[PDB]
Amino acid sequence: ETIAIVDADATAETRSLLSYLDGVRGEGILFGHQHTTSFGLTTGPTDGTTSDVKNVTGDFPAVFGWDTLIIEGNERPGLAENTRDENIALFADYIRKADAIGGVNTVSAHVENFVTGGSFYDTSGDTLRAVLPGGSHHAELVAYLDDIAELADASRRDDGTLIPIVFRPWHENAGSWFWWGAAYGSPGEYQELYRFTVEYLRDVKGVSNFLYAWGPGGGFGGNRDVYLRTYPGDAFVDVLGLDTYDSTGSDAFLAGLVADLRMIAEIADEKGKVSAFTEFGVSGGVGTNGSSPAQWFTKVLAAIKADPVASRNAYMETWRNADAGQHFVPVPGDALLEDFQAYAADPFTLFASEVTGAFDRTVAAAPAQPVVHIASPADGARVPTTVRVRVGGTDVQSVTVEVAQTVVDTLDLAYDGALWWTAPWSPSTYTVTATATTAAGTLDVTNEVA
Ligand SMILES: [Mg+2]
Numbered sequence: 001e002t003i004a005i006v007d008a009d010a011t012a013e014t015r016s017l018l019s020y021l022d023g024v025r026g027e028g029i030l031f032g033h034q035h036t037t038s039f040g041l042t043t044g045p046t047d048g049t050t051s052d053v054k055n056v057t058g059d060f061p062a063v064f065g066w067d068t069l070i071i072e073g074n075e076r077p078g079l080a081e082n083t084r085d086e087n088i089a090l091f092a093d094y095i096r097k098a099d100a101i102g103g104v105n106t107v108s109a110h111v112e113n114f115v116t117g118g119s120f121y122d123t124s125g126d127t128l129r130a131v132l133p134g135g136s137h138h139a140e141l142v143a144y145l146d147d148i149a150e151l152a153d154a155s156r157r158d159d160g161t162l163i164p165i166v167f168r169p170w171h172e173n174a175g176s177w178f179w180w181g182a183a184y185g186s187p188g189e190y191q192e193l194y195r196f197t198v199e200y201l202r203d204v205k206g207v208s209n210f211l212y213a214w215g216p217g218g219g220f221g222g223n224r225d226v227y228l229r230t231y232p233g234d235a236f237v238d239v240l241g242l243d244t245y246d247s248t249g250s251d252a253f254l255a256g257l258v259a260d261l262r263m264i265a266e267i268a269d270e271k272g273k274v275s276a277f278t279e280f281g282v283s284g285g286v287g288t289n290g291s292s293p294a295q296w297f298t299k300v301l302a303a304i305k306a307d308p309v310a311s312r313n314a315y316m317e318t319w320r321n322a323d324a325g326q327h328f329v330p331v332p333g334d335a336l337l338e339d340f341q342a343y344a345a346d347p348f349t350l351f352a353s354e355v356t357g358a359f360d361r362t363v364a365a366a367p368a369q370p371v372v373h374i375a376s377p378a379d380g381a382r383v384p385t386t387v388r389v390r391v392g393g394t395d396v397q398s399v400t401v402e403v404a405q406t407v408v409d410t411l412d413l414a415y416d417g418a419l420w421w422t423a424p425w426s427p428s429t430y431t432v433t434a435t436a437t438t439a440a441g442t443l444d445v446t447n448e449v450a
């Protein structure tokens with residue numbers, strides 16, 4: 001078997017996981033839970049071995065979700081008193097335990113606001129643009145990504161084998177609740193953020209156990225044009241996702257959801273990639289500060305199962321069981337408990353003990369697709385600066401840039417020794433076209449800038 005994978009030199013276990021995730025589509029959907037062994041309402045103090053899901057269904061989820069907030073010391077097992085390095089050691093320990101249980105690990109990144117010192121919910125500071133290549137706070141993103149690379153390398157089985165992780169950075173960017181969202185950067189600025197993240201981890205740090213997930217949000221009504229507006233590209237994404245919460249349980253909701261789920265499944269099928277329901281749940285959760293829409297879990301599942309295309313999604317993850325006010329997996333006292341248990345007992349939903357042959361497959365990577373993109377200035381950006389061009393997946397002889405408004409400037413770039421071909425530029429709508437002469441032929445790309 002030969003598969004399209006973002007990291008063409010990913011570990012055998014990592015290519016196996018991507019193979020497994022595609023093959024499971026339409027046969028069964030893996031249930032996922034965020035912080036499943038680190039936050040619980042029925043577990044007592046957590047140590048990476050107990051889960052609310054296990055306690056109420058008799059099995060751990062098939063997908064264990066985590067966050068880089070652990071590294072920051074803002075979420076258990078991470079502690080604010082700890083160094084980032086000991087938080088990383090705790091993080092890797094919990095991933096190791098999940099793997100031993102038989103689950104698949106996924107990691108999101110609720111990244112701190114580098115500019116303001118605030119949280120991921122602080123949308124001031126112009127932080128997205130500040131962390132892009134050439135940005136005033138770019139070094140801080142680099143430091144943050146180094147910690148992630150460190151975590152990836154610490155995530156090893158007892159025998160030394162790297163545990164595959166589905167890394168899902170910069171999620172829900174079609175909305176504006178996070179500082180990396182749609183109101184704080186053009187689609188092109190977001191794309192360069194995502195591309196840089198992949199390239200820094202894979203190419204500069206040599207991370208080999210990552211699959212890359214991208215999930216811009218939910219509620220697209222099956223509109224591919226809106227959904228793919230911020231699509232980073234085939235060379236950057238392994239898993240296409242969708243994040244949708246509801247508390248109505250209405251026919252209108254389920255119809256819109258099915259439309260989005262078949263949309264992502266079609267796109268993934270066409271591209272030879274995987275699609276997944278990356279986040280789902282009752283809005284506000286199922287606790288005292290949430291809702292109990294009648295039979296919500298089984299209604300969602302029935303709507304998915306009834307559709308032969310919508311059901312072609314590898315996993316569906318719900319959110320963290322923080323406290324009585326805010327939790328997403330029902331516990332005794334919650335009206336939705338029995339319905340979740342019914343959802344869990346459905347043969348279509350897969351839990352930890354039902355995950356088999358995920359990591360031991362023999363599969364080859366398709367050769368990496370050659371790419372060129374202008375990292376600065378990003379498409380849609382407002383502009384002395386440095387033009388940065390990335391050429392990946394091939395040997396490069398030269399890179400030339402033409403600025404047009406009629407051509408007003410021609411730049412010959414030089415390789416910087418690590419990532420970009422660059423040149424100085426001293427600049428009402430410019431067109432910036434990069435042309436790379438490579439061993440895979442001529443590649444070009446055009447960014448439009450104000
Ligand atoms: Mg590598």
Ligand SMILES: [Mg+2]
Nearest residue numbers: 344345346349
């Ligand atoms: Mg089941």
